[PDB]
UniProtKB/TrEMBL annotation, chains A, B, C:
Name under which the protein is recorded: RidA family protein
Source species, domain of life: Bacteria
Taxonomic classification: Bacteria, Pseudomonadati, Pseudomonadota, Gammaproteobacteria, Pseudomonadales
Chain residues that bind pyruvate: 93, 95
InterPro entries to which the protein is assigned, alphabetical: RutC-like_sf, YjgF/YER057c/UK114, YoaB-like
SUPFAM superfamilies, per database record: YjgF-like (SSF55298)
Organism, scientific name: Pseudomonas aeruginosa
Length: 116, 116, 116
């Protein structure tokens, strides 16, 4: 009956759990400068937060994927994304263009998942 | 306790169901080139997925509506949207501008709904 | 087993409740023209809708924050946002750039929360 939080700072919590649902903050890349690397890094951060929250990649319910330049980077995003997903178990998905908080960030992904 | 999926490909599932919730992938138009036609087509695709997932238009919980050109197309979007909705039963809604994966796509809508 | 609605018009309901979840429509500012004022006003509108829906600021699960100009206004948004949040209880959050329905709107925030 109470939300619980993982990795809280003054602006956000990396994850909020409520009953059987896990809400992740939008994840941004690490040090990669290129789209492939950055997508890999975002997805790695998501996989770790899912684990910490009692979920897993197979239990993702929805992902919204924000690309700084969707025309330029959609193909690379899809390549890395499809490799990362568990086979036959893709979530619902929406991919749109949006500038992110820093101009060097090319990709940000926000996930909602089911706790196990 | 397990998500189920409808129309899964290598990138996404058109719908993911979990308990009493239905998460739809962002729906894009069919063959229409114009905003009115494209909005009608997106909403038709949503109505079919709601049916397949055990929901209905009256049970939509939230919609995020992405317009390639919000200044240009907000009025047309609203015309078609309000016609399509069941009377007195509009969902929560957010409408923002975002380029979609192809430049010819003017509108994309992502819905979360309650299973019946 | 049925969604309930708060403040329904022909396009949207300000809030939709379903079981223990509250889905708010994207909230836009009041009369403020500046980013600080507009953010304060959006957050005030959210706090009122949370109250009406049986929730509260401490029970927010996720927020998506849309900025017309993320480079310009991210710092001001964060200042007001962090002041408004209950201490140690920040939600999951995603902040991206998107033009809103009127050019004078600088900020719009969409919240999902847990009913108490």
């Amino acid at each position: 009956m109470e939300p619980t939080r993982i990795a809280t700072n003054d602006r956000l919590s990396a994850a909020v759990c409520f009953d059987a649902l896990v809400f992740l903050s939008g994840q941004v890349p690490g040090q990669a400068e290129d789209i492939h690397g950055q997508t890999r890094e975002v997805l790695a951060k998501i996989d770790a937060l899912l684990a910490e929250a009692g979920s897993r990649k197979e239990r993702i319910l929805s992902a919204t994927i924000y690309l700084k330049d969707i025309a330029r980077d959609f193909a690379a995003l899809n390549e890395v994304w499809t490799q990362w997903l568990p086979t036959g178990q893709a979530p619902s998905r929406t991919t749109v263009q949006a500038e992110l908080a820093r101009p060097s960030v090319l990709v940000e992904i926000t996930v909602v998942a089911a706790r196990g």
